[PDB]
Structure formats: structure tokens, C-alpha cells
Design an enzyme around this catalytic site. Sequence first.
Site, PDB file in Angstrom:
ATOM      1  N   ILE A 191       0.829  -1.197   0.000  1.00 11.60           N
ATOM      2  CA  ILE A 191       0.000   0.000   0.000  1.00 11.60           C
ATOM      3  C   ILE A 191       0.873   1.261   0.000  1.00 11.60           C
ATOM      4  CG2 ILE A 191      -1.515   1.424   1.420  1.00 11.60           C
ATOM      5  CD1 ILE A 191      -2.808  -1.223   2.313  1.00 11.60           C
ATOM      6  N   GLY A 192       1.860   1.296   0.889  1.00 12.24           N
ATOM      7  CA  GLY A 192       2.782   2.413   0.973  1.00 12.24           C
ATOM      8  C   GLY A 192       4.053   2.039   1.707  1.00 12.24           C
TER       9      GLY A 192
ATOM     10  N   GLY B 181       7.981   2.346   8.235  1.00  6.74           N
ATOM     11  CA  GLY B 181       8.191   1.116   7.487  1.00  6.74           C
ATOM     12  C   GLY B 181       7.290   0.964   6.266  1.00  6.74           C
TER      13      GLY B 181
ATOM     14  N   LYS C  64       1.633  -3.468   9.012  1.00  4.58           N
ATOM     15  CA  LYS C  64       2.728  -2.521   8.886  1.00  4.58           C
ATOM     16  C   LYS C  64       3.994  -3.252   9.319  1.00  4.58           C
ATOM     17  CE  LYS C  64       2.413   0.915  11.680  1.00  4.58           C
ATOM     18  NZ  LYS C  64       2.073   2.252  12.244  1.00  4.58           N
TER      19      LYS C  64
ATOM     20  N   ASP D 127      -1.883  12.654  16.377  1.00  7.29           N
ATOM     21  CA  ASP D 127      -1.610  13.719  15.412  1.00  7.29           C
ATOM     22  C   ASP D 127      -2.708  13.803  14.354  1.00  7.29           C
ATOM     23  OD1 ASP D 127      -0.446  15.750  13.971  1.00  7.29           O
ATOM     24  OD2 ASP D 127       0.947  14.427  12.899  1.00  7.29           O
TER      25      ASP D 127
HETATM   26  C1  LIG Z   1      -5.305   2.440  -1.941  1.00  5.26           C
HETATM   27  O1  LIG Z   1      -5.804   2.127  -0.653  1.00  5.26           O
HETATM   28  C2  LIG Z   1      -5.200   2.707   0.430  1.00  5.26           C
HETATM   29  C3  LIG Z   1      -4.503   3.919   0.340  1.00  5.26           C
HETATM   30  C4  LIG Z   1      -3.958   4.454   1.513  1.00  5.26           C
HETATM   31  C5  LIG Z   1      -4.119   3.782   2.734  1.00  5.26           C
HETATM   32  C6  LIG Z   1      -4.832   2.573   2.821  1.00  5.26           C
HETATM   33  C7  LIG Z   1      -4.933   1.961   4.175  1.00  5.26           C
HETATM   34  C8  LIG Z   1      -5.938   0.996   4.398  1.00  5.26           C
HETATM   35  N1  LIG Z   1      -6.074   0.379   5.585  1.00  5.26           N
HETATM   36  C9  LIG Z   1      -5.215   0.691   6.610  1.00  5.26           C
HETATM   37  N2  LIG Z   1      -5.425  -0.006   7.780  1.00  5.26           N
HETATM   38  C10 LIG Z   1      -4.184   1.659   6.386  1.00  5.26           C
HETATM   39  N3  LIG Z   1      -3.346   2.097   7.444  1.00  5.26           N
HETATM   40  C11 LIG Z   1      -3.923   2.918   8.552  1.00  5.26           C
HETATM   41  C12 LIG Z   1      -3.082   2.885   9.832  1.00  5.26           C
HETATM   42  C13 LIG Z   1      -1.672   3.358   9.560  1.00  5.26           C
HETATM   43  C14 LIG Z   1      -0.871   3.301  10.838  1.00  5.26           C
HETATM   44  O2  LIG Z   1      -1.234   2.875  11.932  1.00  5.26           O
HETATM   45  O3  LIG Z   1       0.443   3.542  10.627  1.00  5.26           O
HETATM   46  C15 LIG Z   1      -1.115   2.462   8.457  1.00  5.26           C
HETATM   47  C16 LIG Z   1      -1.923   2.457   7.145  1.00  5.26           C
HETATM   48  N4  LIG Z   1      -4.076   2.280   5.176  1.00  5.26           N
HETATM   49  C17 LIG Z   1      -5.367   2.033   1.653  1.00  5.26           C
END
Ligand SMILES: COc1cccc(-c2cnc(N)c(N3CCC(C(=O)O)CC3)n2)c1
Length: 243
Positions: free
Chosen positions: A12-13, A15, A32, A127
Site C-alpha cells: 500500500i505504501g 516502514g 505494517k 496527530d
Molecule cells: C489504496 O488504498 C489505500 C490507500 C492508503 C491507505 C490505505 C490503508 C488501508 N487500511 C489501513 N489499515 C491503512 N493504514 C492505517 C493505519 C496506519 C498506521 O497505523 O500507521 C497504516 C496504514 N491504510 C489504503
Amino acid sequence: SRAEDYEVLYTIGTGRCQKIRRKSDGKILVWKELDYGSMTEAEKQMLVSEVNLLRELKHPNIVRYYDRIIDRTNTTLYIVMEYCEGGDLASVITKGTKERQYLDEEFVLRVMTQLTLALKECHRRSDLKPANVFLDGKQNVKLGDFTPYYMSPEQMNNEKSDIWSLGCLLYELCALMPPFTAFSQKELAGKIREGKFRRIPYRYSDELNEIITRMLNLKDYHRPSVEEILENPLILEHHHHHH
Ligand SMILES: COc1cccc(-c2cnc(N)c(N3CCC(C(=O)O)CC3)n2)c1
Ligand SMILES: [Cl-]
Ligand SMILES: [Cl-]
Ligand SMILES: [Cl-]
Ligand SMILES: [Cl-]
């Protein structure tokens, strides 16, 4: 509770966050990835402490953190959490700017209502920015994570500071830009201390404009509390979370 119990679908992105599928029942989740291999015992103890506190945050408007997985072969810790298929709010704002299209007032009322309740729960436990606010598949809004556009005047020099930050976030959802902009932090700080900003666009009601404006009061004690926000006649049942 081993990494092998899940298949990675994609990243997703970075870490790094990954959409994953639990093998036993096919349930969709994300994790994560935290590499702790460069950490001291003292830094790993604080990490374990933080993670155990995450596990006890149960609330419909806070990202739910289920499990944690250790992989000593890679010195990698995995935090398993719910999947929010709608992505983050920052991307929603970006989309709006590109499509040259303002967000619905109903949507802004949902974010306000649901984030206010997430904050209420955070305060009770003791935040806020668009990149840390996530949407699920049914119009629910969830607080996650855990140039300072949203910096409050007092934090510049408190639960009312969170109210300021929510005001900035809600303002940016309406205007598609933050209430105070500048090229440097010193210039930003000047604008913030003066406490002036443009009205949100005219497609938004005087009532919505008024509550956002109140949240952006320079005096923390004139900003509405969480309870005063939720008493606002704009906020109705359908703006709340629904399973
Ligand atoms: C393209 O779909 C996406 C784009 C950006 C974020 C997500 C997404 C989906 N579900 C999540 N649980 C999630 N997270 C939300 C919690 C964040 C954190 O605790 O560091 C980590 C990322 N992001 C999905
Ligand atoms: Cl929900
Ligand atoms: Cl526009
Ligand atoms: Cl305007
Ligand atoms: Cl309805």
C-alpha cells in the site's frame, strides 16, 4: 500468529504497509512492517509498550489493531490491523483539487462527527492530519497511525489544541487548502497568531462555517469542547458510524 498464516496481496505504501489475506478464512487485513534490527533493547522495550497499548483501543472510529507478529529471521515486527478500503483523507483532498470539485457538506459533517468521537475516546484514555484519517467501505471515518500547518497558537508558545487541529482539517476538507498558508514556518507562525482566514466556500452553510470558525478561535477556552461540538444541530444520527 505467524507471518506464514497470511499472503501479501500488494504494498500500500512505504516502514511498509501491505494489504494481506488471512489464509484460514480469506479475511482481508493490512500489516505494517517495522524492522527492529537496528534497535537497542531500550528502543525495543518502548516499541513493545506502544504496541500493547494499541491493542486496547477498541472504537468504531479508530483503526483497529488486532495482532503483532515477530520474525526474528528478518528482525521484522508486523502489526496486523483492519483494512480501510477508502484510503486516506489526504488523497480525497488531492482528488478534489484535481477534479476541481468541492466535497459534499454531508461528507464533511460525517468526518466532523466521527473524528470528534475518536478524539473524545482518545481523551478519555488519558496527530490529527488528513494523512492519518482513513475511510472504510461504508462511509465510516477512522483515526489511525499515532511544515506544521495545523499547529495551534498555544502549542506554538491541552485537549483544546486537538479541537484547533480538527478545525484546520475540517477547514481544509471544505476549502481544499489549509486556513493558514506560508512559505516558511516563521511566516506561518505570523499568520496563525493573527487568526484570520477566508470563509470556507459559499456552497457550505453558515452553520458549518460557524462551528469550524469557533474551533479556530485563538483562545483555546472559546473553542467548543467535544461535547459542545456533538450538541450542534447540524450533527444527526446518519453522520455517525454504521456497521
Ligand atoms: C489504496 O488504498 C489505500 C490507500 C492508503 C491507505 C490505505 C490503508 C488501508 N487500511 C489501513 N489499515 C491503512 N493504514 C492505517 C493505519 C496506519 C498506521 O497505523 O500507521 C497504516 C496504514 N491504510 C489504503
Ligand atoms: Cl463502524
Ligand atoms: Cl475548486
Ligand atoms: Cl471563499
Ligand atoms: Cl437519511
